[PDB]
Amino acid sequence: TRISREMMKELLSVYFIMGSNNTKADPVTVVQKALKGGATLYQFREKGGDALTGEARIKFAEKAQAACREAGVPFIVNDDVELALNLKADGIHIGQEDANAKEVRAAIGDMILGVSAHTMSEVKQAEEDGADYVGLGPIYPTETKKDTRAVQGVSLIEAVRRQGISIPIVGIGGITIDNAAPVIQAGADGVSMISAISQAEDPESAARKFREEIQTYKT
Ligand SMILES: Cc1nc(C(=O)O)sc1CCOP(=O)(O)O
Numbered sequence: 001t002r003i004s005r006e007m008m009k010e011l012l013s014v015y016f017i018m019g020s021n022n023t024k025a026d027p028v029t030v031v032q033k034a035l036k037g038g039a040t041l042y043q044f045r046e047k048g049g050d051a052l053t054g055e056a057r058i059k060f061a062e063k064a065q066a067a068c069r070e071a072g073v074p075f076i077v078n079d080d081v082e083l084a085l086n087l088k089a090d091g092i093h094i095g096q097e098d099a100n101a102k103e104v105r106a107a108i109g110d111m112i113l114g115v116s117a118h119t120m121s122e123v124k125q126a127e128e129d130g131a132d133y134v135g136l137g138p139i140y141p142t143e144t145k146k147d148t149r150a151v152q153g154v155s156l157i158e159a160v161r162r163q164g165i166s167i168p169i170v171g172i173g174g175i176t177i178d179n180a181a182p183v184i185q186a187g188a189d190g191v192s193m194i195s196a197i198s199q200a201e202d203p204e205s206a207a208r209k210f211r212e213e214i215q216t217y218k219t
Pocket residue numbers: 116136137138139141142143144145148149172173174175192193194195196
C-alpha cells in the first residue's frame with residue numbers, strides 16, 4: 001500500500017534537495033555529508049543551466065541513490081517519472097505544469113508522490129489526486145530556483161491546517177536554520193532546502209542543526 005501519513009510526516013522533517021549545479025564542491029560528497037548529518041529525505045533535482053545530461057546525469061543519480069540506500073533514507077526523483085521507475089526510486093515529486101498527478105499516481109504504483117502546491121485549492125486537489133505529501137512555497141525569498149511564485153510566508157500553511165486538512169506538508173524556499181522554526185510552528189511537517197546545506201561550508205553540520213531544530217519544534 002501507499003506510505004502511511006505518520007511515516008510520511010517523519011520523512012519530511014529535513015528534506016534535502018540537490019542537483020550537481022547547486023554546489024561548487026563535489027556533488028556526491030555533499031549529498032553524503034547531508035545524509036550523515038541527519039537529512040531524513042533526499043530529492044534528486046538536476047535542472048537549469050550546466051546541469052548534467054545523459055549518462056553523466058544517470059551516473060550521478062545512481063551514486064546519490066546509493067548514498068541514500070546506505071544511510072537508510074528514501075530517494076526521491078524530481079519530475080522524471082521514467083527515471084524514477086527505471087531506478088526503482090522510492091518516490092517522485094512533480095509540479096503543477098509538469099504533469100497530471102492522477103495519471104502519475106496510477107503509473108508509479110505505491111511509490112511516494114509529492115506535488116508542489118501554492119493555493120488552498122491546489123493542496124486539496126493534490127490530495128484528491130493521490131499525493132502523499134505537498135510541497136508549499138516559496139516560504140521566504142529565494143535565488144536558487146528563480147522561477148517560483150511570489151513569497152507567501154507561512155500564512156497558507158496556517159490556513160490549510162485551520163480548515164482541518166491533514167495531508168503531510170513540507171515548506172520550501174529560502175529556508176535556513178534561523179527561519180525554519182516558524183514553518184513548523186505554522187503546522188508544516190518539515191522543511192526542505194537546497195542552498196542552506198549544499199552551499200554551507202560544513203554540509204554535515206548544517207543538516208545536523210536542522211535535524212535538532214525540527215525535532216525540537218515537532219516535539
Ligand atoms: C525547488 C524550489 N521550489 C520552490 C517553490 O517555491 O516551489 S523554492 C525552491 C528552491 C529554493 O532552494 P533554496 O532552499 O536554496 O532557497
